[PDB]
Design a protein around this ligand. Sequence first.
Ligand code: NA
Ligand code: NA
Ligand SMILES: [Zn+2]
Ligand SMILES: [Zn+2]
Ligand SMILES: [Zn+2]
Ligand SMILES: [Zn+2]
Lengths: 162, 162
Amino acid sequence: ALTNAQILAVIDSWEETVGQFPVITHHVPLGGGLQGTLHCYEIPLAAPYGVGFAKNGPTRWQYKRTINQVVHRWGSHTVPFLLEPDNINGKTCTASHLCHNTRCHNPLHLCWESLDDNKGRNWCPGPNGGCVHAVVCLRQGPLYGPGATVAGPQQRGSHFVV
Amino acid sequence: ALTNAQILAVIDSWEETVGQFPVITHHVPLGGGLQGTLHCYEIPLAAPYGVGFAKNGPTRWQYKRTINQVVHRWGSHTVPFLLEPDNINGKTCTASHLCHNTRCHNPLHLCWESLDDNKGRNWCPGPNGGCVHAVVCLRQGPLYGPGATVAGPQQRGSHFVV
DNA sequence: TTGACTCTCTTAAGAGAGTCA
DNA sequence: TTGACTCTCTTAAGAGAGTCA
Ligand code: NA
Ligand code: NA
Ligand SMILES: [Zn+2]
Ligand SMILES: [Zn+2]
Ligand SMILES: [Zn+2]
Ligand SMILES: [Zn+2]
């Protein structure tokens, strides 16, 4: 809600509830042929999810609290960042999963960045493979690699140059 | 429907028309601190665009040819790939700008790959900075770099471990 | 047969808000 | 007040199809 105290109370309640989500260990590629281990705090697959939580889409949830007799609601991963600017360079700030695990609500696996920065982590080589993200990746992006391109650049005639 | 020869004729007419688009020389990052040059064949900003071409969205165009009284229409960047498989790994193939310049229709600046592979090139370090795309990038992706993350992973209490 | 417009849709990273009990 | 559902929207890489003369 409006007050900094009220916002801290929301973050604290959220952390306590998410802290009771099941902790699932995931071993992950780091880049450079190395492997690491992440501990994701995963929201349940079906109701009940936890106090304050409800599912609004297949992999979307919201956190809600009643403050001043009014319901306040947020995207379930946005709560850690309620005291941060909600935009950057004129782009909306989004909750970004460093663990690439949507059900995970561990705030140690989340950052707050533009949607472009968020998306780009999918292809990052990882913290041991050349990640240059200033807020470092926790793992190599799941889509990193050579790709599966069907056809490359080509022309039939002689009208084009690179 | 259209025979191999007829498809080849569509590709040839498309190349003839695109080859007459304004050719714009762009200096671009290659990765590794090096700069290179790309020559983009840019569709005009407003009508007329060229024989067979029409705008269906702010940066979307289509190519149309009428063969034996039947109107055929394709996305304007898909024409170079009409003789290629249109899916791979159960994913639709998309025209992917190696030059990251949507108005460009140079077929030497296009490849044909899944939408995920396509998007991922936005963050590639480039052909001189570590690109691992099997069909190599022509330049460093425009979104490569440290990012502009507003807030990193953090907790207020001690409920979580990474 | 052609040009110049019109409309909505896909994907996978993300969102806000209303209906009931 | 709290829970469990429902709906549509945003973005930026991409698409197909209709109308009129
Ligand atoms: Na993400
Ligand atoms: Na692209
Ligand atoms: Zn996680
Ligand atoms: Zn990274
Ligand atoms: Zn180009
Ligand atoms: Zn590349």
